[PDB]
């Protein structure tokens, strides 16, 4: 039981390594999204004016 | 928020410039239709008066 007790922390440690990984990755992409928004709308800036 | 400031300025800004332009026609309008209804009453009357 206490060798798989230790399976059980190390494999909680990789779960949280990876939720970690997981939540930077997509706030960064949240970043590129929030970019990628502001820039489109900067261009539909002009797209609306001479609309 | 400087986006939906010019597509608001552009939509009222059109409608009203839209508005008074054509209110510039009816105005033009009452300019030579008064001109033109005066000889003409004008010459109505100056008939009926003999």
């Given at each position: 039981?206490?060798?798989?007790?230790?399976?059980?922390?190390?494999?909680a440690?990789?779960?949280?390594?990876?939720?970690?990984?997981?939540?930077?990755?997509?706030?960064?992409?949240?970043?590129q999204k929030?970019?990628?928004?502001?820039?489109?709308?900067?261009?539909?800036?002009?797209?609306?004016?001479?609309? | 928020?400087?986006?939906?400031?010019?597509?608001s300025?552009?939509?009222?800004?059109?409608?009203?410039?839209?508005?008074?332009?054509?209110?510039?026609?009816?105005?033009?309008?009452?300019?030579?239709?008064?001109?033109?209804?005066?000889?003409?009453?004008?010459?109505?009357?100056?008939?009926?008066?003999?």
């Amino acid at each position: 039981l206490a060798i798989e007790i230790t399976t059980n922390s190390q494999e909680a440690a990789a779960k949280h390594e990876a939720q970690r990984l997981e939540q930077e990755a997509r706030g960064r992409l949240e970043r590129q999204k929030i970019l990628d928004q502001s820039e489109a709308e900067k261009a539909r800036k002009e797209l609306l004016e001479l609309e | 928020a400087m986006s939906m400031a010019v597509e608001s300025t552009g939509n009222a800004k059109a409608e009203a410039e839209s508005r008074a332009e054509a209110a510039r026609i009816e105005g033009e309008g009452s300019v030579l239709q008064a001109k033109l209804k005066a000889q003409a009453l004008a010459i109505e009357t100056e008939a009926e008066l003999e």
